[PDB]
Amino acid sequence: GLMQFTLPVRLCKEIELFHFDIGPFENMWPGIFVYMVHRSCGTSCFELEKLCRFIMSVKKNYRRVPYHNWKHAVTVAHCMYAILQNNHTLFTDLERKGLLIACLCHDLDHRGFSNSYLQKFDHPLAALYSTSTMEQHHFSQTVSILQLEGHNIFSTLSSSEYEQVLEIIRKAIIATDLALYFGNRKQLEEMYQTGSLNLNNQSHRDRVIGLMMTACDLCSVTKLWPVTKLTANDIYAEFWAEGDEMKKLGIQPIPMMDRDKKDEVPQGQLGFYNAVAIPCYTTLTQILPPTEPLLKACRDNLSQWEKVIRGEE
Ligand SMILES: COc1ccc2[nH]c(=O)c3c(C)nc(-c4ccccc4Cl)n3c2n1
Ligand SMILES: [Mg+2]
Ligand SMILES: [Zn+2]
C-alpha cells in the first residue's frame, strides 16, 4: 500500500503542465501512467500488481505504427490527467478511474488507417461495426484485456459501479470518433450559450466527457512548437501510407494524404486547427475554464503553421 511511484524532479514538476512531453524513454511510460493514476485517483484505486499486468497487456496490443501507438496512448492519458487535476471537484471517483483507462485504451490495436479506408477496403471490422468502426474495436479489445486472468483492475467495485465504469469507458472511447465530435460540440455550444448546460444531467456529463476525450486525443496540437511539428511528421506518415493504399484500390486520395502533394500539408494543418482544434479547445475552455492553457497553446501553434506557409520557416 505504502509503495509510491516518484519521478525525477524535472518530470515531477512538468508532468503537472498540459504541454508535458513523456519523452523518448519507452520503459518510463508505464511508471508515468501509474504515477498519474495514484495522484488522480489514489494509491488504493487499483491493485498495483493487476494494474501493471493490465498496462503491459495494453502496451503489447498497440502496434508499431508511426502515430497511433503506445506513445499516443500515454500522451492522451496524460492530457486527461492534467484536465482532471485542474478540475479536482467536478468529477466522481468512478469517472477519474474510467477516464484514465479509456485514454490509455482508446486506440488499441490501431493499424494506422481511417474508418473510411476500412469501409473502402471492405475490411471484416467494417461489416461487424458499420459506424465508429475502429472505435467499437478499441472498446472490444479493452473489454478483452480486462477479462484476461489477473487483469481485472475493477474487480473490487460493486456490480453496479463496475457496469457504470465500463459504460463511462465505452462512451469515452466511442467519443474519440471525430465524425461524432462536430455534432457533440455544436450541442455543447448551444447548451452553454442558452445557459441550459447542467453538469448534474447525465446526458450533459456524457457530452462534456466526450469533448474532453476529443481534446485529449488532439493534444499533440497543444505542445511546444518543436514537439507539435515533429509529431505532425508521424501523423502525415500514416496519412501517406493510407493514401498509397487508396491508390492501390484505384482511388485518388485527397492531397493531404498524397505523398506527391506534401506542399499542401501546412494548409491542411491550418484547416484542421480552424475546423477542428480551435473550436474544440474554445468550447472546452467555456465549460472547463482551467483548460485555457490548451486553447492558448493551440492558438500559438496555429500561428506557427501560418509562419510555415508565409515561408518564414
Ligand atoms: C482526421 O483528419 C486529420 C487531419 C489532420 C490532422 N492533423 C493533426 O494535427 C491531428 C492530430 C493531432 N490528431 C488527428 C487525428 C484526429 C482524429 C483521428 C485521426 C487523427 Cl490523425 N489529426 C489530424 N486529423
Ligand atoms: Mg482513435
Ligand atoms: Zn487517438
Instruction: Determine contact, residues 55/36, Cβ cutoff 8 Å.
Output: no
- Write out the three cell numbers for 92: 466522481
Residue nearest atom 13 of ligand 1, based on CA coordinates:
218
State the Cα–Cα distance between residues 180 and 121, nearest whole angstrom.
22
Instruction: Determine contact, residues 83/287, Cβ cutoff 8 Å.
Output: no
* Resolution given for this structure, in angstroms: 2.2
For residue 126, give Cα distances in angstroms to 22, 40, 130, 200, 254.
33, 36, 5, 36, 21
Question: Which of the listed residues 213, 276, 278, 280 should we mutate to test ligand 1's pocket, taking the one with most ligand atoms within 8 A of CB?
Answer: 276
Residue 151, annotated as binding a ligand:
no
Kindly report the length of the chain: 313
The single-letter code of the amino acid at 118 is L
Map out the domains of the chain with their CATH numbers: 28-310 (1.10.1300.10)
DSSP letter string, 194-254: TT---TTSHHHHHHHHHHHHHHHHTGGGGS-HHHHHHHHHHHHHHHHHHHHHHHHTT----
Question: Which residue reads 446526458 in cell numbers?
Answer: 203
User: 302, 134, 287: which is closest to 218 by C-alpha?
Assistant: 302
CA angle 88, 90, 94 (to 5 degrees): 90
State the Cα–Cα distance between residues 307 and 213, nearest whole angstrom.
29
User: 181, 186, 237, 191: which is closest to 211 by C-alpha?
Assistant: 181
State the Cα–Cα distance between residues 285 and 290, nearest whole angstrom.
7
Question: Which of the listed residues 113, 116, 218 should we mutate to test ligand 1's pocket, taking the one with most ligand atoms within 8 A of CB?
Answer: 218
* Residues belonging to the active site: 68
